[PDB]
């Protein structure tokens, strides 16, 4: 019973670590998309400058 | 989708550039019209002096 309790609490602890990881991933993806917007705009008006 | 958006914006700006070029072409042809008028008038009136 003690072993099962410790194992269960370990998995519960790991779950929120995984959620923290997904939060990091979403934040990085948002930043990357914001950068992609500027890249697309530059790709746009580079044709105009050409 | 990102590649599609980039291509679409580039092609739209390309169409605008082509419109700029066609406008330049009509302007040059317009000037050539006044040049042609003077040359034709000179050619016709040369015979009178001849």
From Swiss-Prot, chains A, B:
- Subcellular location field: Secreted; Bacterial flagellum
Name the domain of life this protein comes from.
Bacteria
Q: What does this protein do?
A: Flagellin is the subunit protein which polymerizes to form the filaments of bacterial flagella.
Q: What family does the Swiss-Prot or TrEMBL record give for this protein?
A: Belongs to the bacterial flagellin family.
User: What is the protein name given in its UniProt record?
Assistant: Flagellin
Q: Provide the species name.
A: Escherichia coli O127:H6 (strain E2348/69 / EPEC)
What range of the intact protein is shown?
51 to 100 of 548
């Amino acid at each position: 019973a003690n072993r099962f309790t410790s194992n269960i609490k370990g998995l519960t602890q790991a779950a929120r670590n995984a959620n923290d990881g997904i939060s990091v991933a979403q934040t990085t993806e948002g930043a990357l998309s914001e950068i992609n917007n500027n890249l697309q705009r530059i790709r746009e008006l580079t044709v105009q400058a050409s």
